[PDB]
């Protein structure tokens, strides 16, 4: 099937910033189903477990005291190529080059010690299934039709 | 204090036509604080314990087929006099009768064998404190600062 | 049935202003359902036919001669007391007095000999009735479904 | 000249999905103007003839159930370079290429048997002129002021 | 003539939360002109001068601190009955208060020891014509068209 | 320091097309600073400084009648790496040719004898400073806090 589940996290910066609503519309409005989603503030053992790729490297820390600065949304997308697609809606990894009509590229730009850039999008269906397990138990993510879902009907 | 929490349940009718985003928003643009917030699919006994007061009412059993229809998102807003004003931003209980401007007015007008109103907001703070004690653990509500918090210092 | 058909004259102020897609939006976000469509150029004889209840009042002439300025956009809105919700819609007659919130209130301001106020909606069923049938043969007027019109079935 | 007129056709997962106000709106924020336009439900032998050049392509058949499967909205934008200029608003055919900020890139992905798009819009000057008049007939097509016009007088 | 101006002030609470556009928008939508417009940085003397009528009431001090927190964007705002039509589109003085669709019903809420409203409107055209002789010269009040003037031409 | 100031002057086309606040709304929502702004009519001696290396060009004359044919709003923007970034969110200098989410793709199309192009913005650190003392003041700049800015703290 080409359906995939992604893990999106609304950083801090974006609860901060009152841009929960709109980034959530802009995933509403291609297309894709939100089948899990919650506010929770993350802990640092939890943090560090989600970037666990990147333990060693230099902006480790960094990253995750923003992460873990204030409560976050964390959220499950379903739909059509769901992990590239969100990965492209999301942009440029520093929202100074993401492109204008991408997430990072509409709404960031300032950086603290961490490259603050309003969400984290799974890279790969690999890392979007462990992720998702991170933050969801099966009980959290639903199964149920979207307004058009039976458009589609193949 | 003027500040209080309120109940906002975002129901299957907003869900399924994917307006979440849109309605949290007009809740942040105002100043509201998301202080908890997370998609569950309601059963009936939570449905009837949060609708237990309209149990001998005409519109009981289809009031409760209507509110776990699909999976809602409920949310905890915080905020100066929040139960009343989140009240008068949701408009008049039937859509029809709402006022553009209000989130029903603007979203709302088709029912089925209820009376589809997009969201549900708290009566009272009596009835917001029992609502947020039905559908929240403690654990799942937060106090952190939206940006311009720092503004309003008295 | 509580389903009614009401005509809505997307007038040459709105037309020369670019404000035909908001328009549309507004309707189609509240849940009404567009089920005709068309850009015209009204000639005289048309708009005389359309205003003709007005045939003697003073401001006749001034009003056939703005909704012939330029094309407009009729079209035909479906939904439950489409008529009466589609007047609340548009506000007030006279842009000046209607409520922010509202088409009129928030579109129109600016008049000429004429009360320019952004569209015109019929006034009752009766009114619809007569209209649509003026500005539509049957065959341009068509029964489909919208994306949750599943969700309401009773 | 540069002036150039180009078909859209609102498709109908755009029609079912209340899309239309939204796509209408960002050929009027570009400066484009509706030199006609009008809502139809297209039969197979013109949407076969509107597609004749992928009449031996294997996905054939299910574009044209596809673009009859509900009404749709047919309008002629007019403006310099309409052509290339609306193409590159449309984005890439299949919306999972699409870049964020184009139409397909901002509302598609979801697929059915056919490739479900949003809209069509011609692909070239030629196209466009048997493409209109294949929709359209003369008095359907209007030459007025849009509100800047006088600007850009040169 | 109808035609009036009337003096706006983007106070300190919706510059810095990034609301000056947002509000610039509505009323440029509404057709009202902007005919002057600055950032500035209101200093004690010229706030109390502002604001002498209130010079003995009891939030005056307060008033004073919450106009001069940080720099504000004064702008005059040209059109039909701007006065009143401004007032309109303000809302009550309180943003608790305040209906949706207006500008301190969708913007306001959070107070500090002043009742921040988002923005200051003239409350007459008496107080129009001295707060814009406070805070412009002449020569920074412009006449020129907007797009649709020409529609209006009586 | 990576916290830079351009220079942005809306210009007639945009401000004739009441798009000034849609315009200030994308820098604010970027995460921009506005840290001085004004409304003014720029005589033709100021507009052929401002244009200078274009002097020579073929374009020059009817460039400097474009910037002087109505008033315009000039304004500073602060942020990390504001130059690049403002000539990236308002895209290629002929609208034709930016690509949709940029300022100029979703806004711009239409010419006069000059490519109307929506907004200028400097293109390099050392053309900011020269614009920005070509229309401002230090007195007229500011230096103070965004809702945000404390967020950022590093
Ligand atoms: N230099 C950095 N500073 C702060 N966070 C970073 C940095 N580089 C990467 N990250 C974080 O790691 C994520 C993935 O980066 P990458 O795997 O290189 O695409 C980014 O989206 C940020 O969440
Ligand atoms: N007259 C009614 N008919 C059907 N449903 C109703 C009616 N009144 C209230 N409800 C439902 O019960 C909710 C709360 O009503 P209330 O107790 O008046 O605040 C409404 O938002 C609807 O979901
Ligand atoms: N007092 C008036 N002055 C000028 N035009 C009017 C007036 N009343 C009504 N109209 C025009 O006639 C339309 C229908 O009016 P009504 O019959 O009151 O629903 C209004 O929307 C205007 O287009
Ligand atoms: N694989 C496909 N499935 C469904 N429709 C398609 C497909 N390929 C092309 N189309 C339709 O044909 C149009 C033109 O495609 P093309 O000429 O290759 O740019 C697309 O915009 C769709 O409307
Ligand atoms: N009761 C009040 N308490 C605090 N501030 C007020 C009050 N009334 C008015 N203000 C401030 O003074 C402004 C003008 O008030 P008004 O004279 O009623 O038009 C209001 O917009 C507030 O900025
Ligand atoms: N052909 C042209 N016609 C009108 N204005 C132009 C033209 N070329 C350049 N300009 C103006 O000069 C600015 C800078 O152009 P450039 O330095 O080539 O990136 C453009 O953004 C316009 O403001
Ligand atoms: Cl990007
Ligand atoms: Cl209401
Ligand atoms: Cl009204
Ligand atoms: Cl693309
Ligand atoms: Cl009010
Ligand atoms: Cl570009």
Redesign the interface.
Same mark, same amino acid.
């Given at each position: 099937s080409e359906t995939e589940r992604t893990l999106v996290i609304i950083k801090?910066?974006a $609860? $901060?910033?009152? %841009?929960?609503?709109?980034?959530?519309?802009?995933?509403?409005?291609? /297309?894709?189903k939100? $089948?899990?989603?919650?506010?929770?503030?993350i802990d640092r053992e939890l943090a560090e477990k989600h970037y666990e790729e990147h333990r060693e490297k230099p902006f480790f820390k960094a990253l995750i005291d923003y992460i873990t600065?204030?409560?976050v $949304?964390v959220?499950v997308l379903e739909?059509?190529?769901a992990v590239?697609?969100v990965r492209?809606?999301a /942009?440029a990894t520093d929202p100074?080059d993401a @492109?204008? /009509?991408?997430?990072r590229?509409?709404? /960031? %730009?300032?950086?603290?010690?961490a490259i603050?850039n309003v969400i984290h999008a799974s890279d790969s269906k690999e890392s979007a299934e462990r992720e998702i397990s991170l933050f969801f138990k099966p009980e959290?993510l639903?199964e149920?039709?979207? @307004? @058009?879902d039976?458009?589609?009907?193949?």
């Open positions: 801090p910066d $609860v $901060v910033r009152g %841009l929960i609503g709109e980034i959530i519309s802009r995933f509403e409005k291609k /297309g894709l939100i $089948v899990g989603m919650k506010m929770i503030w600065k204030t409560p $949304v959220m739909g059509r190529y590239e697609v492209k809606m /942009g100074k @492109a204008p /009509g991408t997430i590229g509409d709404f /960031g %730009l300032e950086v603290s010690d603050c959290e639903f149920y039709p979207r @307004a @058009a039976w458009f589609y009907k193949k």
